[PDB]
C-alpha cells in the first residue's frame, strides 16, 4: 500500500 | 476508553499530561516536530476531570527522551497506566501519578520516539510508541 | 535558485507542478499525507511566470508512485530539470516539459517516496527524494 | 561479565539458552536467518556451569517473537537477568529461570527482533535487542 | 511475516 | 541528535 | 560512516 | 539470464566485476560486511567467458559508495547493462564497459547501498540495490 510504516513497541497497560 | 493514534513525526518538542496522585494518568497531548516546525497534536482527554496538569518542555533538538518508564495497575477494576516517567539526555521528568502496580520501562540505545498511540477512558488504558532512526 | 526541503511524511496525495514546453519545469508543490490527514506543502515557485500548471491527483492510499523519470539539460546556460514523469501502479502522468538532455529514472521495487527537496530559480535546478518503508 | 553483540540479521530461527531455577539465566546463543539461510551465532557462555539447557525452535518464517519479558534481580550482589520469556504469534516459551525481582517486557506492535547484544559473567548481566521492519 | 525488509531501488536494464 | 532521519536519493539536475 | 545502523532498545539488567 | 539476489548486509567491502569493452558487463560478485566481518558473496557469472576482471577494494568503513551510474543498451538484441561506474567519497571507479545507450544514475544524499540483486545471462541483464540507513 501507499502508507509509510515504522516500528511500534507496546502496548503497556490494559491488554 | 476512546482510542487515539497520533502517528509518526520528526521528533518530540513538548508533552502535556495530567494525573491524580490517587488514581492514574488522565489527559495526554504532545507537541511534535514536523520537519523543523512545531506540530500541535490532538489533546486526548479523560472522560472525567480533577487531574493535575504537567508540561514537559524539551530543549529540542539537543534534548531527546532516552527512556520511558511507568507503572500499570488496577483502578476501579480497570487495568491502566498509573504512573509515567520520562528520562532525557539532560533531565528526568517524573514520576507522575501513582508508583504502584507492575513496572515497565523502555530504554533506547539507538533511535527516537516519534509518535504515540493508545486509549483513554477515565484514565490512560494503554499506550504504544513509534520508534525510528 | 532558492532551495527548499519539505522533509518526510506518511505519503503523497497530490502533486502540483508547472512547465514550459520550450524551457523546463517551473513551480513545484505537493500535498502530502500526514498520518491519514492531508498536509498542504509549501508552494515553491519560479522567479518568473508563464508556465502551464498541471495537477496530479493520486487515488491515495491505493495509488502510489512506482517510478520517477525525467530529463536534465541546459537552459540559458543553467543545468536544470527540463522534464518530469510520474508512473504509479495505476497510471502514467507525463512527460511534462521538454524531453531533451540526459535522462534519469528512479524505479522503486520496495518502498515509498515520502518527501521532496530541491532548488528553484527561474526553473527547477535539482531535486532529491525521501524514501521509506 | 564478557560483553557480546551479535549485530543485526534478517530474522530469528532458533534460540538456545540455559538457566538455573535458583539463580538466573546462564548461556545464550542464537541461530539467525541471513537472507533465507540459517546463520549460527556465537555461543555466549557463562563463566560457570550447572545450568539447564533449553532449545526454542521457531517455525520460521511464519512464527516470530511478539513479546519478550522477564525479571532482573540480585544474585550474589550482582544485578542480572533472572528470568526470560518469549511469546510468539503461535506459542509462549517460558518463563525460564527465577521469576523474582523487577519485571520488564517488550511487546511489539509492528517490527521484528533481528539481533541481540549483552553481557555474561556467571550470569546474563544485561541485554538489548535490535529492532527492524 | 518474520522476514526483515528494506528499501529496494531498481531495476535498471532489461525490462 | 533528536531529529529523525530517512534515506534520501538524489540530486538530479544542476550539480 | 559506511556501517548500516538499526534501532536498538535496552539494556535490561545490570546498570 | 540466471537471476540472483544477495539480500541485505551491513555494508560493502569489495566489488569484483568483469566487462568487455565491445559488449557489456559480465560477472558480478560482492564481498559484503556482516556486522564487522567480511562476508564473501556468491560469484554470479556470465554464461560465457572472455571478460576483463576488475577488483574494487573499498577502504571500509571510512570509504563508501555515494553514486552508481552506467548505461543500459542493446547487445545482440538483448537489453543489458553495458557500463557501470562507482563513485565513493574518496574516489571514482570506472566507467567499466561500453558507455553507449541510455544513461542512469543513483546519487545518494543519505543512506547506504547494502545489497545487490539482478540477473545475468551472457551479460548483466538488470540489477537493483538495497538501501538502508
Ligand atoms: C468507567 O469506564 C471507562 O474507563 C476505563 C478506564 O480508563 C476504560 O477506558 C473503559 O473502557 C471505559 N469504558 C468506556 C465505555 O469507555
Ligand atoms: C537567472 O538565474 C537563476 O535561475 C537559475 C535556473 O533555474 C538558477 O536557479 C540560478 O541560481 C538563479 N540565480 C539566482 C541568483 O537565483
Ligand atoms: C563473580 O562475578 C562475575 O559475574 C557477575 C555476574 O553475572 C558479573 O558479570 C561480573 O562482572 C563477573 N566478574 C567479571 C570480572 O567478569
Ligand atoms: C543468449 O541469451 C542469454 O543472454 C541474454 C543476455 O545477457 C539474456 O540473459 C537471455 O535471457 C539469456 N538466455 C537465457 C535462456 O538465459
XYZ file of C-alpha atoms and ligand atoms in Angstrom:
656
model
C 0.000 0.000 0.000
C 0.924 3.676 -0.092
C 1.195 4.356 3.639
C 4.647 4.615 5.194
C 5.205 2.379 8.205
C 7.540 2.455 11.197
C 8.412 0.253 14.174
C 5.905 0.310 17.015
C 6.511 -1.074 20.506
C 3.777 -1.649 23.055
C 1.135 -1.593 24.361
C 1.684 -1.117 28.068
C -1.323 -1.048 30.326
C -4.696 -2.686 29.778
C -4.466 -5.647 27.414
C -11.837 4.101 26.568
C -11.507 6.135 23.389
C -8.539 5.040 21.264
C -6.139 7.527 19.685
C -3.169 7.264 17.345
C -1.105 10.357 16.543
C 1.064 8.593 14.001
C 4.746 9.296 13.344
C 6.659 12.587 13.201
C 10.173 14.037 13.063
C 10.566 14.314 16.822
C 9.074 15.484 20.101
C 9.108 19.053 21.404
C 6.707 19.124 24.340
C 4.493 16.710 26.296
C 1.410 17.772 28.243
C -0.157 15.231 30.581
C -2.287 15.264 33.732
C -2.526 12.818 36.644
C -4.094 12.191 40.040
C -1.866 11.012 42.888
C -4.637 8.592 43.981
C -5.651 7.148 40.741
C -3.725 7.243 37.455
C -2.717 9.253 34.359
C -5.508 11.337 32.874
C -5.027 13.535 29.808
C -2.282 13.164 27.201
C -1.208 15.598 24.466
C 2.016 16.035 22.514
C 3.579 18.841 20.509
C 5.661 17.104 17.861
C 8.241 18.405 15.452
C 7.331 18.173 11.796
C 10.413 18.741 9.687
C 11.600 21.659 11.794
C 8.167 23.049 12.587
C 6.117 22.557 15.752
C 3.039 20.420 15.187
C 0.367 20.579 17.882
C -1.059 17.113 18.348
C -4.666 16.496 19.328
C -5.403 16.708 23.033
C -6.648 13.310 24.173
C -8.739 13.863 27.275
C -10.163 11.806 30.116
C -13.904 11.269 30.327
C -13.603 12.856 33.765
C -11.826 15.831 35.361
C -9.887 16.598 38.522
C -6.355 15.876 37.318
C -3.171 17.896 37.854
C -1.640 19.184 34.602
C 2.095 18.903 33.858
C 4.032 20.413 30.957
C 7.283 18.803 29.849
C 9.096 21.216 27.534
C 12.123 19.628 25.921
C 15.071 21.604 24.669
C 14.570 20.329 21.085
C 16.674 19.271 19.194
C 19.552 18.804 21.638
C 17.350 17.236 24.304
C 15.563 13.900 23.479
C 13.877 11.110 25.521
C 16.163 8.155 26.258
C 13.876 6.128 28.478
C 10.196 5.878 29.309
C 9.083 4.013 32.424
C 5.977 3.756 34.426
C 3.508 1.544 36.309
C 0.435 -0.229 35.215
C -2.197 -1.278 37.810
C -5.775 -1.735 38.868
C -8.094 1.222 39.404
C -11.794 0.551 39.994
C -11.351 -2.786 38.359
C -9.660 -1.467 35.225
C -6.041 -2.055 34.305
C -4.482 1.309 33.445
C -1.251 3.303 33.288
C -0.939 4.629 36.847
C 2.467 6.281 36.518
C 4.792 7.674 33.854
C 8.401 8.912 33.861
C 10.398 10.444 31.032
C 14.185 10.420 31.205
C 16.041 12.510 28.613
C 19.752 13.009 27.996
C 19.530 16.127 30.147
C 16.994 15.518 32.879
C 14.399 13.217 34.461
C 10.743 14.238 34.402
C 8.584 12.344 36.846
C 7.427 10.035 38.194
C 3.928 11.385 37.667
C 0.930 9.577 39.109
C 0.902 6.601 41.462
C 4.029 4.432 41.545
C 2.221 1.198 42.396
C 1.453 -1.958 40.403
C 3.675 -3.705 37.865
C 6.571 -1.686 36.448
C 7.625 -1.386 32.817
C 10.464 0.553 31.194
C 11.774 1.232 27.661
C 15.436 2.260 27.444
C 16.649 3.273 23.975
C 20.268 2.704 22.924
C 19.813 3.921 19.357
C 16.697 5.547 17.949
C 13.972 8.056 18.742
C 10.386 8.058 19.947
C 8.493 9.777 17.126
C 4.868 9.105 17.995
C 2.260 7.923 20.477
C -0.960 5.925 20.291
C -3.168 4.462 22.974
C -6.533 4.688 24.652
C -8.127 6.905 27.275
C -11.385 6.385 29.198
C -11.493 7.743 32.762
C -7.718 7.072 32.629
C -4.922 6.127 30.195
C -5.803 2.485 29.460
C -2.669 1.702 27.473
C -0.190 3.232 25.051
C 2.416 2.335 22.447
C 5.245 4.260 20.830
C 6.610 4.763 17.324
C 10.374 4.311 17.015
C 12.735 5.422 14.245
C 16.289 6.399 13.411
C 17.879 29.322 -7.178
C 16.074 29.228 -3.848
C 16.482 25.883 -2.067
C 13.565 24.076 -0.436
C 13.192 20.927 1.640
C 9.725 19.677 2.585
C 11.023 16.884 4.775
C 9.404 13.469 5.221
C 5.740 12.480 5.543
C 3.411 9.474 5.560
C 2.760 9.535 1.827
C 1.794 11.595 -1.201
C -1.738 12.625 -2.148
C -1.378 15.236 -4.877
C 1.391 16.920 -6.889
C 1.058 20.348 -8.488
C 3.747 21.415 -10.940
C 4.055 23.778 -13.906
C 6.251 23.650 -17.017
C 7.024 25.323 -20.333
C 7.343 23.154 -23.440
C 10.332 25.287 -24.555
C 12.233 25.566 -21.406
C 11.867 23.420 -18.278
C 9.896 22.677 -15.084
C 8.757 25.757 -13.199
C 6.745 25.572 -9.977
C 6.555 22.584 -7.630
C 4.132 21.924 -4.758
C 2.989 18.751 -3.018
C 0.022 17.790 -0.870
C 1.326 15.078 1.434
C -0.440 12.706 3.760
C 0.300 13.161 7.433
C -0.920 10.145 9.352
C -4.197 9.976 7.458
C -4.665 13.714 7.062
C -3.876 15.862 4.025
C -0.953 18.202 4.606
C -0.585 21.073 2.146
C 3.092 21.580 1.451
C 4.584 24.976 0.686
C 4.304 26.102 -2.916
C 7.817 26.518 -4.286
C 7.618 28.974 -7.156
C 9.767 30.080 -10.070
C 11.275 33.551 -10.054
C 9.415 34.014 -13.334
C 5.960 33.243 -14.758
C 4.466 31.892 -17.965
C 4.297 28.194 -17.103
C 1.459 25.718 -17.675
C 0.052 24.268 -14.435
C -0.630 20.536 -14.002
C -2.386 18.788 -11.119
C -1.634 15.136 -10.418
C -4.267 13.802 -8.020
C -3.439 10.322 -6.799
C -6.037 7.887 -5.583
C -4.411 7.684 -2.113
C -3.822 5.201 -0.497
C -4.331 2.554 -3.181
C -2.430 4.519 -5.816
C 1.315 5.280 -5.191
C 4.297 6.367 -7.366
C 6.463 3.471 -8.555
C 8.861 5.352 -10.787
C 10.030 8.901 -11.362
C 11.890 9.786 -14.553
C 12.825 12.895 -16.334
C 15.474 14.871 -18.235
C 18.086 17.250 -17.094
C 19.609 19.755 -19.576
C 20.935 23.175 -20.405
C 18.680 26.229 -20.476
C 20.278 29.662 -20.852
C 23.484 28.203 -19.588
C 21.994 26.619 -16.475
C 21.652 22.900 -15.888
C 18.066 22.200 -14.822
C 15.293 19.606 -14.712
C 13.670 20.001 -18.137
C 11.191 17.132 -17.903
C 9.425 15.004 -15.296
C 7.263 11.864 -15.450
C 5.464 10.072 -12.640
C 4.453 6.447 -13.097
C 2.140 4.959 -10.458
C 0.706 1.466 -10.072
C -2.388 2.706 -11.886
C -1.323 5.249 -14.468
C 1.468 7.291 -16.070
C 1.478 11.063 -15.640
C 3.696 12.879 -18.090
C 6.125 13.517 -19.568
C 5.812 17.178 -18.652
C 8.248 19.725 -20.037
C 10.938 19.201 -22.662
C 12.171 15.639 -23.188
C 15.700 16.611 -24.214
C 19.086 16.327 -22.488
C 20.353 13.488 -20.304
C 17.740 11.097 -18.917
C 17.437 9.809 -15.362
C 14.931 7.433 -13.773
C 14.189 6.008 -10.298
C 12.230 2.740 -10.254
C 11.189 1.502 -6.803
C 10.837 -2.225 -6.084
C 10.058 -1.817 -2.392
C 9.441 1.462 -0.603
C 7.707 4.814 -0.943
C 8.582 8.375 -1.872
C 7.652 10.367 1.237
C 9.210 13.756 0.577
C 10.863 16.193 -1.807
C 13.663 18.744 -1.578
C 15.463 20.742 -4.220
C 16.028 24.196 -5.613
C 14.134 26.563 -7.881
C 15.369 29.743 -9.598
C 13.829 30.551 -12.994
C 13.466 26.738 -13.208
C 13.801 23.567 -11.093
C 17.590 23.388 -10.654
C 17.644 19.980 -8.991
C 15.687 17.764 -6.622
C 16.040 14.772 -4.320
C 13.549 12.402 -2.737
C 12.958 10.881 0.690
C 12.401 7.118 0.673
C 10.904 4.872 3.355
C 9.069 1.634 4.014
C 30.950 -10.151 32.539
C 32.154 -10.658 28.943
C 30.145 -8.371 26.575
C 28.818 -9.671 23.243
C 26.991 -8.099 20.344
C 25.736 -10.293 17.507
C 24.680 -7.440 15.290
C 21.586 -7.393 13.094
C 20.182 -10.058 10.769
C 17.132 -10.947 8.641
C 15.326 -12.762 11.434
C 15.470 -15.385 14.162
C 15.224 -19.139 13.629
C 16.239 -20.726 16.933
C 17.278 -19.631 20.435
C 19.418 -21.749 22.766
C 19.681 -20.639 26.386
C 20.366 -22.227 29.769
C 19.170 -21.329 33.270
C 19.169 -22.386 36.911
C 15.899 -22.282 38.814
C 17.717 -20.887 41.876
C 19.986 -18.263 40.309
C 19.411 -16.800 36.828
C 19.975 -17.132 33.067
C 23.289 -18.667 32.052
C 24.278 -19.274 28.432
C 22.775 -17.544 25.403
C 23.107 -18.434 21.710
C 21.004 -17.643 18.650
C 20.608 -19.129 15.185
C 19.621 -16.205 12.983
C 18.326 -16.074 9.446
C 20.591 -14.384 6.944
C 18.672 -13.695 3.766
C 16.997 -17.097 3.742
C 19.939 -19.049 5.142
C 20.494 -20.164 8.725
C 23.361 -18.334 10.399
C 24.756 -19.915 13.550
C 25.582 -17.176 16.018
C 28.394 -17.382 18.525
C 27.580 -19.270 21.710
C 27.981 -16.846 24.597
C 28.676 -18.879 27.706
C 28.660 -18.424 31.471
C 31.953 -18.399 33.360
C 30.417 -21.287 35.307
C 28.436 -24.448 34.619
C 25.474 -26.298 36.074
C 22.665 -24.757 34.015
C 19.715 -26.445 32.312
C 19.745 -26.054 28.512
C 16.638 -25.070 26.559
C 16.138 -25.014 22.781
C 13.497 -22.740 21.289
C 12.949 -23.720 17.653
C 10.687 -21.286 15.847
C 8.687 -22.225 12.807
C 10.468 -19.562 10.667
C 9.198 -17.620 8.756
C 5.569 -17.936 9.812
C 6.409 -17.868 13.521
C 8.089 -14.829 15.093
C 8.564 -13.292 18.569
C 5.907 -10.737 19.515
C 6.913 -10.111 23.111
C 9.928 -10.624 25.330
C 9.538 -10.409 29.096
C 11.423 -11.412 32.196
C 12.803 -10.365 35.539
C 16.003 -8.633 36.640
C 17.240 -9.149 40.174
C 20.034 -9.536 42.664
C 22.178 -12.655 42.738
C 25.205 -12.787 44.946
C 25.211 -8.988 44.911
C 25.071 -8.629 41.139
C 22.085 -7.326 39.209
C 21.289 -9.805 36.443
C 18.555 -11.183 34.199
C 16.954 -13.859 36.382
C 14.138 -14.872 34.051
C 13.195 -14.746 30.375
C 10.000 -15.469 28.423
C 9.439 -15.433 24.663
C 5.912 -15.111 23.303
C 5.443 -15.685 19.571
C 2.334 -15.448 17.392
C 1.953 -19.194 17.869
C 3.136 -20.098 21.351
C 4.664 -18.980 24.658
C 8.111 -20.230 25.612
C 8.958 -19.905 29.283
C 9.267 -18.465 31.794
C 12.806 -19.786 32.165
C 14.806 -19.084 35.301
C 13.631 -17.417 38.510
C 10.588 -15.191 38.353
C 11.537 -12.755 41.149
C 12.819 -9.177 41.137
C 11.619 -6.366 38.995
C 9.719 -7.236 35.805
C 10.240 -5.882 32.303
C 8.514 -6.575 28.999
C 8.771 -5.586 25.364
C 5.599 -6.042 23.323
C 5.962 -5.308 19.598
C 3.030 -3.984 17.543
C 4.971 -3.566 14.326
C 8.515 -4.772 13.667
C 10.911 -7.641 14.323
C 13.701 -8.525 16.718
C 16.707 -9.043 14.448
C 19.620 -9.194 16.869
C 20.891 -9.484 20.417
C 23.715 -7.924 22.413
C 24.550 -8.047 26.099
C 26.967 -9.310 28.687
C 27.508 -12.583 30.510
C 29.663 -13.272 33.568
C 28.457 -16.034 35.892
C 25.015 -14.994 34.583
C 23.375 -12.788 31.921
C 24.187 -9.312 33.236
C 22.043 -7.406 30.751
C 20.896 -7.480 27.150
C 19.470 -5.293 24.389
C 17.698 -6.056 21.126
C 17.918 -4.848 17.534
C 14.589 -3.869 16.064
C 13.710 -3.539 12.392
C 10.886 -3.629 9.897
C 5.805 -12.343 8.323
C 9.137 -12.924 10.047
C 11.490 -11.691 7.308
C 13.070 -8.278 7.745
C 12.609 -5.948 4.785
C 14.500 -2.939 3.434
C 14.106 -0.370 0.667
C 14.977 -1.562 -2.838
C 15.505 0.678 -5.873
C 15.632 -0.606 -9.426
C 15.744 -2.462 -11.695
C 17.961 -0.888 -14.347
C 18.486 -2.734 -17.584
C 16.296 -5.295 -19.317
C 12.595 -4.720 -18.669
C 20.601 14.287 17.909
C 16.830 14.354 18.291
C 15.826 14.636 14.634
C 14.531 11.541 12.860
C 16.304 10.714 9.612
C 15.379 8.784 6.476
C 17.037 7.662 3.242
C 17.447 10.361 0.614
C 18.353 9.758 -3.031
C 19.452 12.482 -5.413
C 20.014 15.160 -6.508
C 19.133 15.120 -10.181
C 19.710 18.246 -12.191
C 22.232 21.002 -11.557
C 25.189 19.774 -9.518
C 30.269 6.293 8.011
C 29.799 3.110 5.996
C 28.185 0.906 8.660
C 24.450 0.326 8.442
C 22.558 1.090 11.642
C 19.259 -0.069 13.136
C 17.105 0.712 16.162
C 18.275 -0.779 19.460
C 16.208 -0.996 22.651
C 17.670 -1.801 26.042
C 19.591 -2.617 28.105
C 17.679 -4.592 30.725
C 19.550 -5.896 33.719
C 22.728 -4.633 35.351
C 23.126 -0.866 35.039
C 19.586 -14.909 -17.676
C 20.016 -16.548 -14.247
C 18.537 -14.252 -11.524
C 20.391 -13.645 -8.245
C 19.590 -11.762 -5.078
C 22.245 -11.409 -2.384
C 19.956 -9.864 0.173
C 20.908 -7.096 2.587
C 24.018 -6.673 4.738
C 25.852 -4.185 6.991
C 27.873 -2.654 4.175
C 30.150 -3.213 1.201
C 33.860 -4.012 1.382
C 34.865 -5.079 -2.128
C 33.273 -5.448 -5.574
C 34.557 -7.830 -8.253
C 33.151 -7.438 -11.758
C 34.239 -8.181 -15.321
C 33.440 -6.456 -18.618
C 34.183 -6.376 -22.335
C 34.824 -3.023 -23.970
C 32.767 -4.103 -27.008
C 29.752 -5.747 -25.365
C 28.762 -5.153 -21.724
C 29.208 -6.149 -18.067
C 29.863 -9.832 -17.455
C 30.449 -11.294 -13.996
C 29.418 -9.693 -10.709
C 30.457 -10.606 -7.156
C 30.492 -8.679 -3.885
C 32.284 -9.027 -0.563
C 29.907 -7.528 1.983
C 30.393 -6.596 5.602
C 28.346 -8.573 8.081
C 28.437 -6.860 11.445
C 32.157 -6.146 11.261
C 33.133 -9.345 9.463
C 33.788 -9.820 5.757
C 31.134 -11.929 4.060
C 32.042 -13.375 0.675
C 29.006 -13.209 -1.568
C 28.260 -15.718 -4.285
C 30.055 -15.121 -7.570
C 27.405 -14.588 -10.228
C 28.938 -15.485 -13.564
C 28.226 -14.982 -17.255
C 27.174 -17.952 -19.372
C 30.216 -17.044 -21.472
C 33.836 -16.037 -20.951
C 36.303 -13.535 -22.355
C 35.733 -10.636 -19.953
C 38.275 -8.413 -18.209
C 38.175 -8.710 -14.401
C 38.212 -5.660 -12.135
C 38.574 -5.535 -8.343
C 37.214 -2.549 -6.444
C 38.573 -2.635 -2.890
C 36.979 -0.002 -0.692
C 38.646 1.375 2.381
C 35.769 0.154 4.633
C 34.389 1.695 6.814
C 35.591 5.199 6.004
C 35.024 4.774 2.268
C 31.537 4.110 0.880
C 29.675 4.397 -2.455
C 27.867 7.710 -2.946
C 26.727 7.259 -6.529
C 26.242 4.446 -9.006
C 25.861 5.245 -12.693
C 26.086 3.476 -16.008
C 24.460 2.751 -19.325
C 21.853 0.240 -20.487
C 21.752 -0.737 -24.136
C 21.185 -3.277 -26.854
C 23.597 -6.146 -27.391
C 22.743 -8.871 -29.820
C 19.096 -7.885 -29.415
C 19.070 -8.026 -25.626
C 18.767 -5.006 -23.361
C 21.568 -5.161 -20.799
C 23.795 -3.117 -18.504
C 26.633 -2.067 -20.813
C 28.538 0.144 -18.388
C 28.944 0.723 -14.658
C 30.645 3.410 -12.554
C 31.041 3.591 -8.777
C 31.784 6.929 -7.133
C 32.738 6.864 -3.452
C 33.511 9.698 -1.034
C 37.175 9.130 -1.846
C 37.465 8.097 -5.477
C 35.734 7.246 -8.764
C 35.934 3.702 -10.089
C 35.121 3.333 -13.764
C 33.468 3.658 -16.138
C 33.755 -0.049 -16.898
C 32.309 -1.479 -20.090
C 30.787 0.399 -23.025
C 29.482 3.889 -22.425
C 26.679 3.889 -25.033
C 22.899 3.594 -24.767
C 20.682 5.274 -22.277
C 22.268 6.558 -19.055
C 21.087 6.071 -15.485
C 22.463 7.223 -12.146
C 21.715 6.880 -8.461
C 23.159 9.607 -6.244
C 22.634 9.087 -2.502
C 22.305 12.048 -0.116
C 21.620 9.980 2.973
C 21.872 6.197 3.246
C 23.932 3.208 2.137
C 23.851 0.532 -0.534
C 23.706 -2.711 1.445
C 22.886 -5.311 -1.189
C 22.558 -6.260 -4.833
C 20.151 -8.368 -6.872
C 19.770 -8.841 -10.604
C 20.138 -11.241 -13.475
C 22.999 -12.440 -15.645
C 22.854 -14.390 -18.907
C 25.658 -13.729 -21.393
C 25.684 -10.279 -19.737
C 24.206 -8.388 -16.758
C 20.552 -8.127 -17.783
C 19.484 -5.813 -14.971
C 20.132 -5.082 -11.320
C 18.622 -3.410 -8.260
C 20.075 -2.228 -4.965
C 19.122 -2.473 -1.298
C 19.189 0.835 0.503
C 19.382 1.408 4.245
C 20.415 3.851 6.923
C -15.647 3.509 33.524
O -15.008 3.107 32.310
C -14.253 3.638 31.229
O -12.910 3.908 31.677
C -11.989 2.789 31.741
C -10.628 3.253 32.262
O -9.608 4.165 31.917
C -11.842 2.173 30.328
O -11.272 3.086 29.402
C -13.232 1.737 29.863
O -13.169 1.138 28.575
C -14.168 2.953 29.835
N -15.489 2.448 29.413
C -15.975 3.052 28.288
C -17.339 2.578 27.787
O -15.388 3.939 27.663
C 18.958 33.504 -13.855
O 19.262 32.667 -12.737
C 18.629 31.976 -11.669
O 17.974 30.801 -12.187
C 18.795 29.630 -12.429
C 17.944 28.495 -13.001
O 16.819 27.721 -12.645
C 19.453 29.189 -11.097
O 18.491 28.791 -10.131
C 20.280 30.364 -10.575
O 20.934 30.021 -9.360
C 19.366 31.578 -10.358
N 20.239 32.673 -9.891
C 19.874 33.189 -8.680
C 20.734 34.325 -8.127
O 18.910 32.796 -8.016
C 31.615 -13.117 40.025
O 31.462 -12.119 39.020
C 31.231 -12.131 37.633
O 29.850 -12.293 37.366
C 28.911 -11.244 37.554
C 27.512 -11.775 37.228
O 26.828 -12.371 36.134
C 29.295 -10.052 36.659
O 29.225 -10.402 35.270
C 30.778 -9.704 36.997
O 31.173 -8.522 36.235
C 31.703 -11.001 36.750
N 33.069 -10.580 37.057
C 33.891 -10.452 35.941
C 35.336 -9.960 36.166
O 33.510 -10.671 34.797
C 21.698 -15.593 -25.445
O 20.856 -15.283 -24.339
C 21.032 -15.200 -22.946
O 21.580 -13.942 -22.594
C 20.812 -12.748 -22.609
C 21.724 -11.575 -22.234
O 22.562 -11.181 -21.155
C 19.631 -12.891 -21.633
O 20.089 -13.052 -20.283
C 18.872 -14.190 -22.044
O 17.687 -14.335 -21.202
C 19.886 -15.443 -21.995
N 19.091 -16.614 -22.360
C 18.830 -17.479 -21.301
C 17.951 -18.716 -21.583
O 19.228 -17.282 -20.159
